[PDB]
Short mmCIF file of C-alpha atoms and ligand atoms in Angstrom, two decimals:
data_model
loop_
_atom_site.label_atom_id
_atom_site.label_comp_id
_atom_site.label_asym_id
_atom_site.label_seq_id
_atom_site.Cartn_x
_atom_site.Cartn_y
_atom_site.Cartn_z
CA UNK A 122 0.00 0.00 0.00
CA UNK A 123 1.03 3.54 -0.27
CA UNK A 124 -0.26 6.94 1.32
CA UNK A 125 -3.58 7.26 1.58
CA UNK A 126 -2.87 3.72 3.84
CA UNK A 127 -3.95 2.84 6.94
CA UNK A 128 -0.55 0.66 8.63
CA UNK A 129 -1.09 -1.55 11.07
CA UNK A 130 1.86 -3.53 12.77
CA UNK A 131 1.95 -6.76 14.32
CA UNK A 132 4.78 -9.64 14.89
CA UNK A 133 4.74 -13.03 16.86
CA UNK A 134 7.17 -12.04 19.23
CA UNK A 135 4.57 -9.62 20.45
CA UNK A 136 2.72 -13.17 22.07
CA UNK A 137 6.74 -14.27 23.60
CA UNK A 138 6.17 -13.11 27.03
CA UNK A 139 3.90 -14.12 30.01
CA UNK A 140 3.67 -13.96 33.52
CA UNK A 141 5.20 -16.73 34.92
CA UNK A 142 3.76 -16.69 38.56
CA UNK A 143 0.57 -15.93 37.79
CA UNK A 144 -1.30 -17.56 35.43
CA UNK A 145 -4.13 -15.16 35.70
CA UNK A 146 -2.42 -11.96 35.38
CA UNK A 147 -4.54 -9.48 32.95
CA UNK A 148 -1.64 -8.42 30.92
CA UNK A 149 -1.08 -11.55 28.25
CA UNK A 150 -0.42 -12.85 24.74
CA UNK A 151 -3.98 -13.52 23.92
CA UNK A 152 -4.37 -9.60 24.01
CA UNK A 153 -2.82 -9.07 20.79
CA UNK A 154 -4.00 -12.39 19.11
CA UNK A 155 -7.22 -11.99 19.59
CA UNK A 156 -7.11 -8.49 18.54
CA UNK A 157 -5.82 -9.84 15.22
CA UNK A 158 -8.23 -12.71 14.89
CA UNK A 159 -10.97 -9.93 14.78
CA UNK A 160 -9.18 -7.88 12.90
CA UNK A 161 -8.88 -10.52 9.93
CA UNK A 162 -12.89 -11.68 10.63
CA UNK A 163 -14.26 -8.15 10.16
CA UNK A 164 -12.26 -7.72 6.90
CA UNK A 165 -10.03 -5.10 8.01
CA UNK A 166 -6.79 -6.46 8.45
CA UNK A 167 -6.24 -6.92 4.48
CA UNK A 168 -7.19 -3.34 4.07
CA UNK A 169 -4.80 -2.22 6.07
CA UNK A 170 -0.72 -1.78 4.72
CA UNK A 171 1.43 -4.45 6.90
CA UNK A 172 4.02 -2.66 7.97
CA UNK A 173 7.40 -3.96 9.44
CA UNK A 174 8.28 -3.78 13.07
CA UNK A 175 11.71 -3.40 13.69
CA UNK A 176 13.73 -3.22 17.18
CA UNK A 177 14.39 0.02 19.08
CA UNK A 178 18.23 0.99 19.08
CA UNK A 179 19.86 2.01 22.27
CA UNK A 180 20.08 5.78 20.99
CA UNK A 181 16.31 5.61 20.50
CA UNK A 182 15.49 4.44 24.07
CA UNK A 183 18.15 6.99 25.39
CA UNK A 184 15.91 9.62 23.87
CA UNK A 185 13.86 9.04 27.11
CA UNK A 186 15.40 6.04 29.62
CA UNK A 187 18.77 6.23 31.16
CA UNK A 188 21.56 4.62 30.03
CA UNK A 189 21.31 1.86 33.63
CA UNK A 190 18.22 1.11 33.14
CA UNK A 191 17.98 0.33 29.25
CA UNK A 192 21.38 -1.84 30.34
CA UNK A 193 19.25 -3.39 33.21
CA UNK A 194 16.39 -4.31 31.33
CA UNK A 195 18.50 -5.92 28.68
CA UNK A 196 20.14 -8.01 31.15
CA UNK A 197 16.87 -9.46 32.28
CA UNK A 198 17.35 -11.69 29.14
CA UNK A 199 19.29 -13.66 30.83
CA UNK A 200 18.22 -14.00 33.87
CA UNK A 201 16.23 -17.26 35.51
CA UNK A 202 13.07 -16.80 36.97
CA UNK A 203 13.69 -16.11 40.93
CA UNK A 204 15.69 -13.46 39.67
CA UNK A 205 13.03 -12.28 37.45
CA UNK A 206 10.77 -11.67 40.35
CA UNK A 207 13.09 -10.26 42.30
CA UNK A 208 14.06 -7.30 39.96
CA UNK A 209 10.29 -6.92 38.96
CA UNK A 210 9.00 -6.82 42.30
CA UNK A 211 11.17 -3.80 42.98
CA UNK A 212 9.05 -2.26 40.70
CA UNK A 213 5.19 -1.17 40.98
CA UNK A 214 2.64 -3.49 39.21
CA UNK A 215 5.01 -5.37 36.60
CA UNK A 216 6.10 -9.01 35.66
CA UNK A 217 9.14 -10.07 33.93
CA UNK A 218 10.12 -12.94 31.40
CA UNK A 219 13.03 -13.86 29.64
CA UNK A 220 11.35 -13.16 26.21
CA UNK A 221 10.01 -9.43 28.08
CA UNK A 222 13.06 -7.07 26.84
CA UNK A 223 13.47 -8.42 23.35
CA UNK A 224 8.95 -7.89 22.93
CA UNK A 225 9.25 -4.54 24.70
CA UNK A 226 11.90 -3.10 21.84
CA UNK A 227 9.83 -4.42 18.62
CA UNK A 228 6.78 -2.90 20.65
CA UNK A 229 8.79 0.93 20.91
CA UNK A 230 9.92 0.17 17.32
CA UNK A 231 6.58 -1.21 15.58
CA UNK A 232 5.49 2.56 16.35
CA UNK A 233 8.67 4.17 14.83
CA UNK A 234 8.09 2.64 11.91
CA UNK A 235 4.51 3.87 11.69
CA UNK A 236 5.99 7.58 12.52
CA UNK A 237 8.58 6.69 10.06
CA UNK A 238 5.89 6.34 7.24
CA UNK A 239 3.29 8.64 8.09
CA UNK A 240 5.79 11.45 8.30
CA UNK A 241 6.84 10.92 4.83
CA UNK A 242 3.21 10.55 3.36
CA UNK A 243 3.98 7.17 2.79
CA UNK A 244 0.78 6.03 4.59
CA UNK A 245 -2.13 8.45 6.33
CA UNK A 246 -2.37 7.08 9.64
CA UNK A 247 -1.71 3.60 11.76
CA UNK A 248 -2.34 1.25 14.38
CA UNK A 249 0.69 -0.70 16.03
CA UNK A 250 -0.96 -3.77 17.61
CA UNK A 251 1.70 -3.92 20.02
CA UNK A 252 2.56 -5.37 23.96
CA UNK A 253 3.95 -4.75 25.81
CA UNK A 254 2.23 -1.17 26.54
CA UNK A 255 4.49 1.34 27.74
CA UNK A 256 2.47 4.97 29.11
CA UNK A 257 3.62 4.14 32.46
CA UNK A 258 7.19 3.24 31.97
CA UNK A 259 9.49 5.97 33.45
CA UNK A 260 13.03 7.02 32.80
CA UNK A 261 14.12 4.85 35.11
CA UNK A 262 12.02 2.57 36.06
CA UNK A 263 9.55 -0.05 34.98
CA UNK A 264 5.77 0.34 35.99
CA UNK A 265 2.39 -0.54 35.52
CA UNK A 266 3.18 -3.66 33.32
CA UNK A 267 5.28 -1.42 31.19
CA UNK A 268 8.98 -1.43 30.19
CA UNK A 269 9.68 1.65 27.70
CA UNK A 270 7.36 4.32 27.19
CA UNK A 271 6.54 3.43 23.75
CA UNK A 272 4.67 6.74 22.51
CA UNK A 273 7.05 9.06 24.72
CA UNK A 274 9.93 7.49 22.57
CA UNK A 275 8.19 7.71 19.26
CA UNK A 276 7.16 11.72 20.73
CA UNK A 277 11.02 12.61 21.01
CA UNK A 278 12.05 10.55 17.58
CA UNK A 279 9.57 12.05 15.55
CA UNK A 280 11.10 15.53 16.66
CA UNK A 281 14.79 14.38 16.30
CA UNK A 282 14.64 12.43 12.83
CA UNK A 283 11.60 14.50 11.29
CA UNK A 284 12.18 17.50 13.02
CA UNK A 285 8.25 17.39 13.95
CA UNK A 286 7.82 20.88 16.49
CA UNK A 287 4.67 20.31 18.09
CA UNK A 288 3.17 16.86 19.25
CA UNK A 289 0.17 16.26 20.62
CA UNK A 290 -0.45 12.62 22.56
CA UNK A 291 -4.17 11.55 23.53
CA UNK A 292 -4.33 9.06 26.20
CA UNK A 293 -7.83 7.20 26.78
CA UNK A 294 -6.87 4.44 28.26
CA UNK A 295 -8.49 4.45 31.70
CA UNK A 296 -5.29 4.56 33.39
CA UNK A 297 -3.33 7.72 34.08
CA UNK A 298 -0.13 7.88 32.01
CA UNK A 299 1.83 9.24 33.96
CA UNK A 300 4.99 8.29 32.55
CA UNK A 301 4.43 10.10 29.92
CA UNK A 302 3.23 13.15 32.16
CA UNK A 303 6.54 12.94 33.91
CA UNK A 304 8.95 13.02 30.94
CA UNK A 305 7.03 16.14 28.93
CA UNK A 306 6.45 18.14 32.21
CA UNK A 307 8.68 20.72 30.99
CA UNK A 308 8.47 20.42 27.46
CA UNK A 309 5.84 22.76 25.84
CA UNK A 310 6.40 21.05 22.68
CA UNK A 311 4.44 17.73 23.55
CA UNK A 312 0.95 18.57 24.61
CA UNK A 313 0.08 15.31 26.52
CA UNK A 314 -3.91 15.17 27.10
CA UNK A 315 -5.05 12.35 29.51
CA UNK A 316 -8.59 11.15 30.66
CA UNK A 317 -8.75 8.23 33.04
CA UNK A 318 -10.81 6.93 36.27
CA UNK A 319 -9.54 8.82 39.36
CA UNK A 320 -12.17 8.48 42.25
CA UNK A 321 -10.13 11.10 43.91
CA UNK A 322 -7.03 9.42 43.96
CA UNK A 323 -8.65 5.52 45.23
CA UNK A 324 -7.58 3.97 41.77
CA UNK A 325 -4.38 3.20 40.34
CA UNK A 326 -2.13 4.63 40.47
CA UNK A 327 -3.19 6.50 43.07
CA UNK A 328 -1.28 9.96 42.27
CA UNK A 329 -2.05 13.63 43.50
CA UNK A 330 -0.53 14.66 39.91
CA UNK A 331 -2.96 12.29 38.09
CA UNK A 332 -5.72 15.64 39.07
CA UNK A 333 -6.07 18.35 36.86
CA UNK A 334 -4.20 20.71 38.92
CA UNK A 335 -1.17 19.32 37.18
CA UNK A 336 -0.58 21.46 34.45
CA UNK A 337 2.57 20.70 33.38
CA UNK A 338 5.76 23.59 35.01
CA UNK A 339 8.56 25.70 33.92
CA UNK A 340 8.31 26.57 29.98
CA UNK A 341 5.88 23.32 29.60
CA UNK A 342 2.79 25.05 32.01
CA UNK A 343 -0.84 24.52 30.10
CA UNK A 344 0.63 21.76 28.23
CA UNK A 345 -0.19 18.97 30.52
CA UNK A 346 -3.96 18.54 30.99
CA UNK A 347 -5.49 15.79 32.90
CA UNK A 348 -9.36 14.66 32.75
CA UNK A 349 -10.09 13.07 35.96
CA UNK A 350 -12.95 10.54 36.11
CA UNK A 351 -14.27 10.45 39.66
CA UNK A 352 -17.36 8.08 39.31
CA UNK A 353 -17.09 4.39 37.78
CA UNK A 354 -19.64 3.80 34.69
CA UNK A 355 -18.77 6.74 32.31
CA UNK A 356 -20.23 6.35 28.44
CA UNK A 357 -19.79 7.12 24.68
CA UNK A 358 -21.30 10.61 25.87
CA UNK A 359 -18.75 11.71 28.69
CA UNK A 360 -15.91 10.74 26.63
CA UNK A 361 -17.13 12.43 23.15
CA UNK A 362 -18.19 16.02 25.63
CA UNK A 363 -14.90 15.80 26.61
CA UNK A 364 -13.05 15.58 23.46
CA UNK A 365 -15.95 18.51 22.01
CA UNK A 366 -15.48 20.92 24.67
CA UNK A 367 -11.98 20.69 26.34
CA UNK A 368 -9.60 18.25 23.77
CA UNK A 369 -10.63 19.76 20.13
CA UNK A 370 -10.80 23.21 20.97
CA UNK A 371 -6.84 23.14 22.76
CA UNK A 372 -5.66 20.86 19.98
CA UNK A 373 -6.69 23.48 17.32
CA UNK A 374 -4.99 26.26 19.07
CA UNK A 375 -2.04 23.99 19.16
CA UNK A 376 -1.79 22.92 15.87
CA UNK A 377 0.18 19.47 16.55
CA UNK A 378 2.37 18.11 13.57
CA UNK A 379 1.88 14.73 14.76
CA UNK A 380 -1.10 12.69 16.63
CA UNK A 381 -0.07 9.88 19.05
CA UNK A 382 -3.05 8.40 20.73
CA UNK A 383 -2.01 5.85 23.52
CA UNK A 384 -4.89 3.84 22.74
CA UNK A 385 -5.79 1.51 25.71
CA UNK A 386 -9.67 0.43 25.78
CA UNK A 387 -9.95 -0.35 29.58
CA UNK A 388 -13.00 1.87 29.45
CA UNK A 389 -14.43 -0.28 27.33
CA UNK A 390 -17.83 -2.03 28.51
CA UNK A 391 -17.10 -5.28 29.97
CA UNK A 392 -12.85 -4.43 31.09
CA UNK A 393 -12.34 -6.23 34.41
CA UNK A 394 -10.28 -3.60 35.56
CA UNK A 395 -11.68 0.04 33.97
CA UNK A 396 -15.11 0.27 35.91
CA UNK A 397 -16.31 1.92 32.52
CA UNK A 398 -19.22 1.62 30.07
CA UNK A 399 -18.53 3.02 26.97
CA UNK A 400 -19.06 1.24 23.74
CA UNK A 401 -16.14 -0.32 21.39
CA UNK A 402 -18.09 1.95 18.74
CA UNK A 403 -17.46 5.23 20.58
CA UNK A 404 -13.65 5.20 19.37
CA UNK A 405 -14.40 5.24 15.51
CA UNK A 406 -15.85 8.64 17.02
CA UNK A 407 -12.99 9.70 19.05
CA UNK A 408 -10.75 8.64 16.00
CA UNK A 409 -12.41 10.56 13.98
CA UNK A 410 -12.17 13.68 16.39
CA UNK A 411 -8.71 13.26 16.13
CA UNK A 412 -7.98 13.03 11.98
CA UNK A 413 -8.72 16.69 11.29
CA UNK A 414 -5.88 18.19 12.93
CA UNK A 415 -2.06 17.12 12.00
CA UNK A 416 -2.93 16.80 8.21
CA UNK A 417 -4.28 13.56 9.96
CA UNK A 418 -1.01 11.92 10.86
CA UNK A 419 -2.33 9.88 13.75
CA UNK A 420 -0.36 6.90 14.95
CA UNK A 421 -2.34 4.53 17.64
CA UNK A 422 -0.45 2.38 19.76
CA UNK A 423 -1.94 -0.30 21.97
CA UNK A 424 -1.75 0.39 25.75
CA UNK A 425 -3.92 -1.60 27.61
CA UNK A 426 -7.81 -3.10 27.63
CA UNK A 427 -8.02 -6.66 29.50
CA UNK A 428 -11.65 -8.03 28.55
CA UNK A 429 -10.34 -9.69 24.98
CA UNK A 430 -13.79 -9.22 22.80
CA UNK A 431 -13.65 -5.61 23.79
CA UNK A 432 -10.85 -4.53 23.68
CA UNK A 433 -10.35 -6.41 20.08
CA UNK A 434 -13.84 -4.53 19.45
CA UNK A 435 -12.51 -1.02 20.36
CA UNK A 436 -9.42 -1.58 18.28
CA UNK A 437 -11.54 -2.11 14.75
CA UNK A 438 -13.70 0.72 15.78
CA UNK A 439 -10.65 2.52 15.37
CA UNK A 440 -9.41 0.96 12.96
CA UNK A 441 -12.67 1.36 10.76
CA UNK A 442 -12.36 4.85 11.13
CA UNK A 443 -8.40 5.14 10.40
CA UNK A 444 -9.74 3.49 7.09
CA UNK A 445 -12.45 6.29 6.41
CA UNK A 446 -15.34 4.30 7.19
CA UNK A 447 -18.41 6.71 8.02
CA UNK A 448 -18.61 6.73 11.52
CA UNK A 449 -21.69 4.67 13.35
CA UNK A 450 -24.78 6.41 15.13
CA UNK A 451 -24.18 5.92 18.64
CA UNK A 452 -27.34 4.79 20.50
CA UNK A 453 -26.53 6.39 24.18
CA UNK A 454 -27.04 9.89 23.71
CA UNK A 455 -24.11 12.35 23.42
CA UNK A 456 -24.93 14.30 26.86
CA UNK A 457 -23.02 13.82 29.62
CA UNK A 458 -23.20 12.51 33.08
CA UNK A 459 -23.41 15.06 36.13
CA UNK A 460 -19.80 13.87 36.96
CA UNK A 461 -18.37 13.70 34.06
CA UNK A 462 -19.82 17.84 33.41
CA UNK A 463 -18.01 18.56 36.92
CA UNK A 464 -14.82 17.27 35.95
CA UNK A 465 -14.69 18.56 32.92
CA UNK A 466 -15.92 22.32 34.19
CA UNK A 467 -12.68 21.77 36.66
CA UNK A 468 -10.02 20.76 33.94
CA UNK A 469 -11.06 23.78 31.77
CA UNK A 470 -11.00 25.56 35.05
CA UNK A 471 -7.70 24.48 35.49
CA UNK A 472 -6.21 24.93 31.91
CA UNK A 473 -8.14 28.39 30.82
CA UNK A 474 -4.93 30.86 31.88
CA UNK A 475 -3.19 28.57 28.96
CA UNK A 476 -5.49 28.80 26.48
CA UNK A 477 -7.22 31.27 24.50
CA UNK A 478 -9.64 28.68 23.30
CA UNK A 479 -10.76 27.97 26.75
CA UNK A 480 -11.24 31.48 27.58
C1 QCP B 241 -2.89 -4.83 42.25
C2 QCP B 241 -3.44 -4.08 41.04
C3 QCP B 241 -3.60 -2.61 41.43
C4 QCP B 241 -2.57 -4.28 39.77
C5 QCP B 241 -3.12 -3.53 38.62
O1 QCP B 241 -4.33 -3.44 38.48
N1 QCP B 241 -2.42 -2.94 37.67
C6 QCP B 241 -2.44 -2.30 36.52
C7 QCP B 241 -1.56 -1.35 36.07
C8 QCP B 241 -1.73 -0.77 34.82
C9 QCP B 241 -2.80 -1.11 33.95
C10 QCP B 241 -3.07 -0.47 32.64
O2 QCP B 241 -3.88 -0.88 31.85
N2 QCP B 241 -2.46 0.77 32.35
O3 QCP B 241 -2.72 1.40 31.19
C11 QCP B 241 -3.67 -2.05 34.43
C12 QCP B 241 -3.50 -2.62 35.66
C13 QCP B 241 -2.49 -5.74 39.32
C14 QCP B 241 -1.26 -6.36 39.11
C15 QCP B 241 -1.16 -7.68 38.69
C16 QCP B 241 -2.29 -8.44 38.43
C17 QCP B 241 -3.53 -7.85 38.61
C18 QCP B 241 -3.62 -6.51 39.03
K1 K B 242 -5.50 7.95 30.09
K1 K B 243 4.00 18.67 28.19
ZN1 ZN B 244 -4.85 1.01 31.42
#
């Protein structure tokens, strides 16, 4: 395929790595499979371009991780399984594997090669169908059931090797990214936008700077902005008022160069973990909100989603609109929830001295 493509990434090694103490953890091979599976059923996998992934090189994780820890993680590779546990449990919320490292740098590089391609109007748009996720992974440190912060890397590339000056990531995975909020703090160059389930701090990962108050400091103030969720069961409507009222109108007045969406679907209906109800349908909306901005270079990258029909249902939502599909009516109706209105209200409340848009 060529540029008016959707790519879409995927390898085997991506399915190399499991927990090996717990044979129920959430985060696990049949994530991605099954993603594909549905993929192929609905007929959109062969309308997508396959693209190559390829592994991240040291200088490309040393755009955001320290030189220890990338040497760290590699050795993991070769480490048995006691010591495994031991390294990971130094870490919040992760597992380790011998196959881990070498799945975690085709997952940072399936999305450089989508950058790579969109950048140079060799495709639209993609979809990297990737694991392990990586919006929590810090400089330093593993987290979350992330190694290396996949979109944060692909951020900082696309400015060094395309020479991209604004970037805009959209997290709506249910989780906060922090990670990413951490290593853009001070950069008004990457406008990082999250929404995620809050509850005033009771969910994971439990963070004061996961509120809206955190607006990013130094030369990167206003170009953090958090959308707390502080009620479980939030729909199509909460998340689509949000991206109308507080997302569109900012990224307009930014005028990103590139789109990186860390696209987990925890909030999907049925995710064991997200406490959400919105439909796999609403992201061919929230897609769509994104394409009109960037001359529509968007790049998706799987974070996380747990319940495997959904979250393989809110990546061909996606996906159908990445491939210009006209977008579905959505039966819930577009208004939002009292809670969802007051968090919103407070976000724009705390943004509005940032942006003209807002005002
Ligand atoms: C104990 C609990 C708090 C922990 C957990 O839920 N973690 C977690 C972190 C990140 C994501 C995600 O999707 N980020 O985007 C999802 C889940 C956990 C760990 C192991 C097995 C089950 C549960
Ligand atoms: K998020
Ligand atoms: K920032
Ligand atoms: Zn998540």
């Amino acid at each position: 395929g060529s540029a008016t493509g959707t790519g879409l990434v995927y390898v085997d090694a991506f399915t190399r790595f499991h927990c090996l103490w717990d044979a129920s953890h959430p985060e696990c091979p049949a994530r991605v499979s099954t993603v594909m599976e549905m993929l192929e059923t609905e007929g959109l996998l062969g309308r997508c371009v396959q693209v190559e992934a390829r592994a991240v090189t040291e200088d490309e994780l040393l755009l955001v991780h320290t030189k220890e820890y990338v040497e760290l993680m590699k050795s993991t590779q070769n480490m048995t399984e006691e010591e495994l546990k031991t390294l990971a449990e130094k870490y919040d919320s992760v597992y380790l594997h011998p196959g881990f490292f070498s799945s975690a740098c085709l997952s940072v590089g399936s999305v450089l090669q989508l950058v790579d391609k969109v950048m140079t109007s060799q495709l639209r748009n993609g979809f990297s169908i990737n694991r392990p996720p990586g919006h929590h992974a810090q400089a330093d440190k593993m987290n979350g059931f992330c190694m290396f912060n996949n979109l944060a890397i692909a951020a900082r590339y696309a400015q060094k090797r395309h020479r991209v000056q604004r970037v805009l990531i959209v997290d709506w995975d249910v989780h906060h990214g922090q990670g990413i909020q951490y290593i853009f703090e001070e950069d008004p160059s990457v406008l990082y936008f999250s929404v995620h389930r809050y509850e005033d701090g009771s969910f994971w990962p439990h963070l004061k700077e996961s509120d809206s108050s955190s607006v990013g400091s130094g030369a990167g103030q206003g170009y953090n902005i958090n959308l707390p969720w502080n009620k479980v069961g939030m729909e199509s409507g909460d998340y689509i008022t949000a991206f109308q009222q507080l997302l569109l109108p900012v990224a307009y007045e930014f005028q990103p160069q590139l789109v990186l969406v860390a696209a987990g679907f925890d909030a999907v209906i049925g995710d064991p973990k997200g406490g959400m109800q919105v439909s796999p349908e609403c992201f061919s909306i929230l897609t769509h909100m994104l394409k009109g901005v960037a001359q529509g270079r968007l790049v998706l990258a799987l974070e996380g989603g747990y319940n495997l029909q959904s979250t393989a249902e809110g990546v061909c939502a996606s996906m159908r609109s990445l491939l210009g599909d006209p977008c579905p009516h959505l039966p819930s109706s577009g208004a939002p929830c009292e809670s969802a209105l007051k968090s919103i209200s407070k976000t724009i409340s705390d943004l509005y001295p940032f942006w003209k848009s807002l005002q």
